[PDB]
Design a protein around this ligand. Structure first.
Ligand SMILES: *[C@@H]1O[C@H](CO)[C@@H](O)[C@H](O)[C@H]1NC(C)=O
Lengths: 48, 48
C-alpha cells in the first residue's frame, strides 16, 4: 500500500456466462434371471 | 411385483439333416477278419 491505498483491478464491463453440469441421479435397472443365465433351458444344469 | 423364472418357447418340430445314400461302413467285416495282428504290428482302418 502507498499512502494506505492498495492497487486493485475492478471490473468496468461484464457479461453473463452459462456453464452446464450433468449430475447422474439414476442408472439402468439391470435385472438378472440367475437360473436362466446360469442354465439356459437344460434340465441337467437346473438340477445341479 | 414378482419377476417369475424365465421360460423358453418349447420346440414345435424337429429338423434332422444327414447326407443321404452313403454306404455301410462294414466295421464288423474288418473286426471279424481271421488274420488278427499282434500288439507289436497292430492294424488300422479308417471309416469315413
Ligand atoms: C461492454 O462490452 C460489450 C461487448 O464487447 C460492448 O458491446 C459494450 O459497448 C461494452 N460497454 C461498456 C460500457 O464498455
Amino acid at each position: 500500500s502507498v499512502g494506505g491505498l492498495y492497487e486493485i483491478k475492478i471490473p468496468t464491463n461484464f457479461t453473463i456466462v452459462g456453464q452446464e453440469e450433468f449430475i447422474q441421479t439414476n442408472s439402468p435397472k439391470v435385472t438378472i434371471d440367475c437360473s436362466l443365465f446360469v442354465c439356459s433351458n437344460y434340465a441337467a444344469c437346473h438340477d445341479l | 411385483v414378482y419377476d417369475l423364472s424365465g421360460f423358453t418357447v418349447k420346440p414345435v418340430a424337429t429338423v434332422h439333416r444327414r447326407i443321404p445314400d452313403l454306404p455301410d461302413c462294414d466295421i464288423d467285416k474288418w473286426l471279424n477278419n481271421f488274420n488278427v495282428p499282434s500288439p507289436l504290428n497292430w492294424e488300422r482302418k479308417i471309416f469315413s
